[model samples]
Target: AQYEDGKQYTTLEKPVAGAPQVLEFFSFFCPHCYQFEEVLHISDNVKKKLPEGVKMTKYHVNFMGGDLGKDLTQAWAVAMALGVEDKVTVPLFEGVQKTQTIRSASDIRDVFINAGIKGEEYDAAWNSFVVKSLVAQQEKAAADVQLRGVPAMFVNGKYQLNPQGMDTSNMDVFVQQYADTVKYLSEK
Candidate 1:
């Protein structure tokens, strides 16, 4: 299904061939999303088991509001536009979790710059139309999706897969089960 216009989609529009796509909506400040990062990374197991066309994309939610969220959102926008999400996502994650420090757009830019991305390119991308549109789009998606909490997953843009809703007691189990379900759905 097509993401709503004027809303930020988790990722840019990409075609899905053999299987439905998975969009993982998460936030930088969310402890659970940080904890679940390893699972998300190794989800390639699920991909290997899926039908050839299935894919999973992650969207970092900047819903914290206020200056903190805005700063993070801007940083993310730069990363998204530059196609260097993988380069900076992990370090940002570590900075937030391990250092217990707040990261702003400038911080994110520094990370990109340190990672070898050009300063001018990073600046231009951060301020580009696409980044602005994406920031707005993500905000809209949060509202339209009626996201009650962070670290939520959506399958094919319809199903809501909340680990807490499925089982409140065991977060790890719920996450694993959810991943398994996604794999099952992909092969169906």
Candidate 2:
């Protein structure tokens, strides 16, 4: 209910207009981001509260994972393009943040393979023009955000959610407030 600009959210410098979407800026290598999904379950909770037809777009930041950062971003782009996000997302996150087993793009391919996607299919998607374009756009969006942290959300590419400024001790209250802010921003 207290959806104040500059407090709950920050307006974008170059606002993008069109379909309503919550753009989430995160990195698979980030522990906080991993906990965002695994522990907090923020995305899932917020997603269910979203209006019909509205969707959250995950942008794998190209600034983490050292030399593998861009590669991980490309892998995420590939997953999006292939429509296999549900299958590969958690595995990718676990591989990097939990197991620390993924060291290269090949390791990413193994994750997809284990998820039941054919190796050749994953390879093709990884090299496709769609994935390339998505990776380019994701990098551009990340740069536009000038991000210094992970697990940040931008609603309609216009307002950046600031959960850090809110109370998060109570899970239900936190999720409700977060979703309410997201809904408010989606209409702004």
Candidate 3:
């Protein structure tokens, strides 16, 4: 079960080609997720800074929880589906968390509208098969993964890590931990 650099990161259930596929779970509605925007600078930034060949995927989870409460888990799905994840991903955290520009899910549409995202593009994806499928994907993918909190990460598909499991508090080393772990995975 151990991999080449097994000491660093866990192996995923699904292996990606050429390099490790890094994925993170996020939510615009969560207060903690917003902290990443202020702290780790959020997912998109992390994704941008990813080492070459390391494909990063950010999934916005559904807020509706069973045996408990509910919320708009599909907010990011629609944006991502419409190919505007980059446009809204940051605002989703910044607008909602930092500036309070987004007070609720209802304000999301306007967020997209102001971002210059086309209505037709959104109309086609929102609630469409692709978006819905992504929702289902998030559900099934993380179903078994133990999560400590927001800003959780998974390597390939099997190995998991979270902010709490991190070895360093400094952002540079923290970020390198990812590069180091996945770089090792890529070689294996």
Write model 1 residue lDDT over 1-188, tens digit each, in one string.
32222221232244333223666677777777777775444344445555666666666676654576677776777777778877887777776777755456677677777788999998888778998997876666665566667776666655555454345366566555656666644433
Please tell me which predicted candidate would have the highest lDDT against the true structure.
2
**lDDT ranking from best to worst?**
2, 1, 3
1 versus 2: better TM-score goes to: 2
Residue 183 in model 1: lDDT: 62
lDDT per residue as tens, model 2, 55-132: 778888877777798899999898888889889889999998788999988898999999999988988888889999
> Against the true structure, what is each candidate's TM-score?
0.74, 0.90, 0.70
Give the residue spans of candidate 3 off by over 4 A. 1-20, 35-54, 63-72, 144-148, 165-169
RMSD of each: 7.5, 1.9, 4.7
Worst 10 residues of 2 by lDDT: 12-21
Model 1 clash pairs? 7-137, 8-137, 8-138
lDDT of each: 0.63, 0.83, 0.60
